[PDB]
Amino acid sequence: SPLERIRLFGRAGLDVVAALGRSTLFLGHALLGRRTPGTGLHLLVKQLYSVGVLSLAIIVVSGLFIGMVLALQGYNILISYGSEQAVGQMVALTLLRELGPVVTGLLFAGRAGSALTAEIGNMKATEQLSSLEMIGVDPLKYIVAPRLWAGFISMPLLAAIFSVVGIWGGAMVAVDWLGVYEGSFWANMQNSVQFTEDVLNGVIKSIVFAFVVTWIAVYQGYDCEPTSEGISRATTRTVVYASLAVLGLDFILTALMF
Amino acid sequence: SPLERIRLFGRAGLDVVAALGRSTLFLGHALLGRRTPGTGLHLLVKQLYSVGVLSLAIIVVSGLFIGMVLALQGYNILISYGSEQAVGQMVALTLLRELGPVVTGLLFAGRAGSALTAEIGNMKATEQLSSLEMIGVDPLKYIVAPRLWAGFISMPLLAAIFSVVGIWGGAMVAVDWLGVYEGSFWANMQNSVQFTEDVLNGVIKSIVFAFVVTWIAVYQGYDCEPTSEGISRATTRTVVYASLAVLGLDFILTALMF
Amino acid sequence: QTRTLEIGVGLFLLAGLLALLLLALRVSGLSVGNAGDTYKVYAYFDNIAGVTVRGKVTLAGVTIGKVTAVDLDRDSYTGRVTMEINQNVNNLPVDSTASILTAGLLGEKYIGISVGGDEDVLKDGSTIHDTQSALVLEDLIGKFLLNSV
Amino acid sequence: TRTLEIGVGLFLLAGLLALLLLALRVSGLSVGNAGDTYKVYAYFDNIAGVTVRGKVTLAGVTIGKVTAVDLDRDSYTGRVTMEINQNVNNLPVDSTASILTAGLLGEKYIGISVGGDEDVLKDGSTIHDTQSALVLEDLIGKFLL
Amino acid sequence: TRTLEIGVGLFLLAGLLALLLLALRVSGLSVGNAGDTYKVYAYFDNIAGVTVRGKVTLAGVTIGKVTAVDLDRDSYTGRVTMEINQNVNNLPVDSTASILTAGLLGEKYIGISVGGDEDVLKDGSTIHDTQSALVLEDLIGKFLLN
Amino acid sequence: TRTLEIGVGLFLLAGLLALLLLALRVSGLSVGNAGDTYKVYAYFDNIAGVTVRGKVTLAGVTIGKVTAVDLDRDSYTGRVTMEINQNVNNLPVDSTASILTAGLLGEKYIGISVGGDEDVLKDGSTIHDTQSALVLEDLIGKFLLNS
Amino acid sequence: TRTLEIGVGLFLLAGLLALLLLALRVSGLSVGNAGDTYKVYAYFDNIAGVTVRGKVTLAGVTIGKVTAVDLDRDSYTGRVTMEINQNVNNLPVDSTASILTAGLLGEKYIGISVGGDEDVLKDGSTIHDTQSALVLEDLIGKFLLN
Amino acid sequence: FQSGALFTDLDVFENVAFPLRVHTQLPEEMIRDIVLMKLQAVGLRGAVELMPDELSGGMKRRVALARAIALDPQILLYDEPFVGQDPIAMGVLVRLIRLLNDALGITSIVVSHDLAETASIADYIYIVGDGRVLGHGTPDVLKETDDPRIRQFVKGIPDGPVPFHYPARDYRADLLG
Amino acid sequence: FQSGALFTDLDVFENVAFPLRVHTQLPEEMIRDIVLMKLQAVGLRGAVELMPDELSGGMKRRVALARAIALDPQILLYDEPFVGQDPIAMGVLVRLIRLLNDALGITSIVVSHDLAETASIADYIYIVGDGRVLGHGTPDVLKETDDPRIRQFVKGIPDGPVPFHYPARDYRADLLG
Ligand SMILES: CCCCCCCCCCCCCCCC(=O)OC[C@H](COP(=O)(O)O)OC(=O)CCCCCCCCCCCCCCC
Ligand SMILES: CCCCCCCCCCCCCCCC(=O)OC[C@H](COP(=O)(O)O)OC(=O)CCCCCCCCCCCCCCC
Ligand SMILES: CCCCCCCCCCCCCCCC(=O)OC[C@H](COP(=O)(O)O)OC(=O)CCCCCCCCCCCCCCC
Ligand SMILES: CCCCCCCCCCCCCCCC(=O)OC[C@H](COP(=O)(O)O)OC(=O)CCCCCCCCCCCCCCC
């Protein structure tokens, strides 16, 4: 029925409505609820390991490849303009103000934005997440608070590591394989950086959709209905949305500052 | 034990070894095994819907955002060079030869590279994938062959749609919000395209790691051990690898052709 | 009725997100801490070929501001440029001249000013009287060696 | 009133099909164009650098855009055609348009010098006289002997 | 059912249309700029910066594009073969084809002069005389050595 | 255990170092670039090509960076103030400081011409004499078109 | 399936370590550790564009990089220090070395004329005679203004 | 199978028809009639439209059983049929798996960890352990086999050949030292 | 719970200690001794090092039970304990859930769809249905309550208040028309 079809559409409207409402409530309860008995900092260490460190080889190799691609594209894009040696101010400006954090999102939100949702989803599905209450610990502070903290304090560091490896790979292909001159590269690069105005720009950009990624990437895991199909669908909702939001907030955050 | 630690490391070596070996065998059996009784083409239609169409809104919105970001970055990157009106030959060359298909991979491999693995994973886990044999149909031709075909014939179309919407959004922000002149944009764009040499380049680039994405994105789903934790880990392995391979083959495919 | 509460908070958050449009939020040419008070001035030139808007008007090298707009006064068919001056710069006599320069060799044709000397200084919203138009690679070559041989 | 809230879907539809028409208002009937201001012709002997839809200016201020360029094989000449805003119509007919080059490498562009002949531009008259675009090769081949 | 077929078909057509819009409009392919052009040859002493698909023009306005370049194995000159739009069909025989560079760094295109009042061409013939492509070296070392 | 603490600390430190290498060995703010250095002023008649974060040099090699260009509201000249490395503290006061364009089209740095005196510096004072920077409109309005 | 497993693990670790080494030889750039070649110095009056890692060359072909540039507190001049590929060991002391600039916008690089014919070098000694780099300003100064 | 193993893609009707639409070429009406009579036999005749996603986990198995008995196979296997459902659903299922055998005379191989109902309905039960059949018999002989392994299995008797405790070291030393 | 509900993060020992490390501040030795005596009581004393990922699905529940009985709670709940395991594991578990009650004198609330073993061990069984307790009693009174709903539940008797067939339209018309 078309009228009831639109009824279902509107029900989905109110559904995402109440969804992110409940999400912000969840986030509040998690970051500022109380202090639980069985918490600490070792939790944060274990998480930060599972979320950042394990997801580090991926972004290292990905930074390598995307950097040398950025080079092999800039060299050939610009040799048609003579200003070949200026490739440094490209491979280090695009890889540092916009593409750096965007790809770092789409990868972090790819792996650690998912195997983080499936983790606390599975937890909810084997009731493990529930027996915590019957014990007495608040899960939203023992199970998910270290997730959020491993998010906020990993993805920015990951973006930095990615940008570094990207620039270095771009140089290594440009210097050794393209043949452009050694010192000229870093020279034009440092002459065209504007630290507080591009580097810090990219870092605040990284942090904001670090927060946004590992916010949904954990909420979805907390909300998914407990069944092996439910989790299998939540760990896809949290890639759809974690990429949508990465790019959307990249766009807004770059309209705030060109 | 360190010696046994290296033993485990080497066991993982042989493991990924035999893994992708078995993967290529699987792919062969799937695409060229036999012709099954209960197959057809309606299967391909249903799949192609579930894989392409549902994953179309994501890449539409993502193309929009990434295009207007590419613009808002090019305008400001290049106004410092005077050649402002040349933004068209940027927002339409980067979004069409390298970044277009790469982001289309990281998104398709994000959503339809996962909710495709979880699907045929869940199938294997509720034994649904197994009763097909006890009936007699070969699953590798009824369950996964339409997956592969919905992969190969969707991701390239998706890359094209993405590049189109990206260029159009870049124009819409450049024309209406940046104020650069209407005809000049498309003019410098078409004067600097080299169809058979950039457009077709981007399309073959899209196709190759369409094949590569929806190859692992279905193999992993076929191999994952049947348990709600197994699938929850496979649908992360098939984002790690589906992004690794996207970028790696992008790099190789752009070293084949600058 | 937790559903109602969730809906309310979600609407608050969607409002907070819509509060970030960034299509003329803080209309200005600079930040909100900087007053942006820059008084007007006009100037009458005969060719401003490379004095496009967003240039840099300067004096003795240091920037004094930017060009705001360029116009063709339909009476004399000359160029009239309207530009701005930081208020701390309020000490330019009227007999001073303005003229288009070129940053290095292929730098955008900015305009510099040469201070003359006269006790009265500025209405700062007035125009200039005398100038030297931008040099052009055509009339220069034409009068030196295209037609003077 | 949960059925009485189907309206949300309505809103969204009215919110979606709206955006579509706004994505399709690329023309933007909120007029900011110039309404196809008036065409002018000119004949040159060489327009080498003049590309289609460059810029036409006078006294440095951009007057408008060159609409098109062509060649008349009878005279073997370059007939260029450009629009000019209507607010500036006081051009005299004798006023000559000559190709200039911005700076030293800035792209070629036609600039007009007023003629003050008291006959305002008839709005359609081809340019009577001009100075063609210079050519580096012309310069060097004129003085090497 | 049917809505599946309709959706998937509509959006397959959407994909293919997008591929063409990338092909036809943005990439500026044949159909938009296809036409009937004929060939001609030209013997130059030097073509230093004549690139394939460089422009060939007269009176400033573009005419066609160079098709191909060759070195003649006999006199070791540059035989350049280039296209001309058919509507351009009145170039006489003694016209001169020289190499011109608009901006001092602009690419080395070719421009042809007016050849008096003789028969036009076969448009498939060659040209006789020329003004070859200058270089910086010859420019300076010419005005040196003594 | 602790094999996890060591790893996570390692890579926290790796990210931190990477942030620094972006900030310092890729943007070059201050690790010896504009730290222990001492000021000086100079009065130029035109600083057209002189920009902030430029370079003050002597005999080609860099001596330091420039800090702030300003207009002295009385004479309308340029007051250019710049830092100098502390190891370099041997300049005479009569020495000039001209503006040189890098190569042929590069940015405009400024270079010092040792004049030769006994009094060396105050490193925070100004300079007496110098040569301004050229500009095309001048040179061509100079002895080329006055006939 | 118990020996070759550990063997494969060791093979993999060795390969990763080798990739590591090959990667690190990019920094501390791939022309040896110390060359592993011989140093030399030179004094100039202006080295404006001879920043770290600039080409030292003879007869056009580069010989090595520059290593360091300094302002000697005594003579107020510039001192530049550079290595030399060891196969290049026949440079007489009486050579000169001026700061060439490839083309016009090229990054300045020092080119060495053999000069005279005498004792080759100590390869760690200094040079004596040379021509500093030119500056546009002096040129359009001394030779135009006065 | 247990958990039904229905195809989430196809509705109930098509799901049950699938084996026919595979091994036989029947007029699409006649397939509908066989499907209908089978669904009636199992009772899920009404939900000939539901998708299994919509179907309550209980009947989600009886429809699978109907799909099985389609084609009228002469033998059929049961992977843990009566495991984890309210004794009403377990009762109807244990009535059907026996009705199919008493009527249709088709061999049926239940495979269930549940000893009680298995030994209740079964005729010649086996016991599979660590790659070797650990004997076999009709329920009676099996109830008193006195083979320690088996007699430990078929009864509660937690401690026997299969150990109760894990292989610890010492309840005295470890807790003391 | 059923499926144990162990924390995949922590090994067995820390997992069992968790409630102590939460509600009580004991010398880290003394916690170890309580954990050890409990694990012995349940039998999983040996695997004081395994991670639950490494632990076979059977004992993966007995360790959870030990974690429960930690702190010596006076009442404790069982979410479908004896559901889906070989009758040896079911036997040891039904022996433990009863040993804890006969010895420790702690109230225990089994919650199981399995009627047989529940009614075997339970003392005052309930029946919850559609938001209302559908009566209650000791096993005996419950075996002959004659309340159609209940007597249908506690016995096989598939057809009764809970219907067998789905709400179809007609076995004649639909198949004919
Ligand atoms: C009058 C107020 C009362 C209610 C108003 C709520 C409407 C606002 C929320 C819109 C979301 C509707 C989508 C539902 C469709 C659906 O099927 O749902 C689509 C999905 C969920 O689909 P499924 O549940 O079927 O999987 O939801 C989403 O996509 C959520 C992302 C939407 C964006 C959230 C933030 C909005 C950003 C700002 C808007 C940009 C517009 C630009 C204008 C300048
Ligand atoms: C994924 C692919 C990467 C993109 C590369 C494709 C081609 C490059 C872009 C085309 C623009 C160059 C044509 C103009 C020719 C010219 O004169 O360009 C060369 C000119 C010459 O002046 P200089 O010698 O001073 O450099 O310099 C510049 O234009 C400066 C811009 C260089 C690039 C710096 C990085 C800013 C670019 C945007 C960053 C984020 C965008 C990337 C993702 C959206
Ligand atoms: C050209 C104009 C562009 C238009 C701009 C509009 C889009 C803006 C960006 C889109 C955001 C993506 C929406 C994803 C949410 C969703 O899909 O909503 C859907 C999901 C849940 O929906 P379901 O559970 O029903 O599937 O939302 C969530 O998971 C809950 C949290 C949502 C995350 C919101 C992020 C807000 C960003 C705040 C940044 C400020 C913080 C900085 C502090 C330091
Ligand atoms: C101003 C009010 C508008 C608020 C935003 C409207 C949200 C409407 C979302 C519906 C979109 C299609 C959903 C189809 C359902 C489906 O099949 O697919 C639904 C998909 C996922 O499919 P599933 O149902 O299988 O989960 O969900 C999505 O990802 C929908 C993403 C919506 C994102 C909206 C972001 C706003 C766009 C910003 C553009 C900025 C331009 C402005 C320039 C001036």
Ligand SMILES: CCCCCCCCCCCCCCCC(=O)OC[C@H](COP(=O)(O)O)OC(=O)CCCCCCCCCCCCCCC
């Ligand atoms: C025109 C050219 C034609 C090109 C042909 C395409 C060939 C594609 C083959 C790619 C193989 C895909 C793997 C399939 C998925 C799978 O099953 O593979 C899955 C298995 C993992 O199995 P398990 O994890 O389950 O054990 O292996 C993988 O994970 C593969 C990882 C893919 C990484 C790709 C990296 C390639 C780039 C390397 C370049 C190195 C650069 C160094 C220079 C300095």
Ligand SMILES: CCCCCCCCCCCCCCCC(=O)OC[C@H](COP(=O)(O)O)OC(=O)CCCCCCCCCCCCCCC
């Ligand atoms: C001629 C030289 C070309 C050599 C080609 C090889 C390059 C391709 C290597 C594939 C990348 C492996 C990452 C896969 C993700 C993963 O492992 O997934 C991450 C896993 C996850 O671990 P878990 O088992 O605990 O989940 O971590 C690992 O165990 C792997 C550790 C090492 C893997 C290699 C990564 C660093 C080495 C990269 C080499 C780059 C060389 C640099 C060039 C100069």
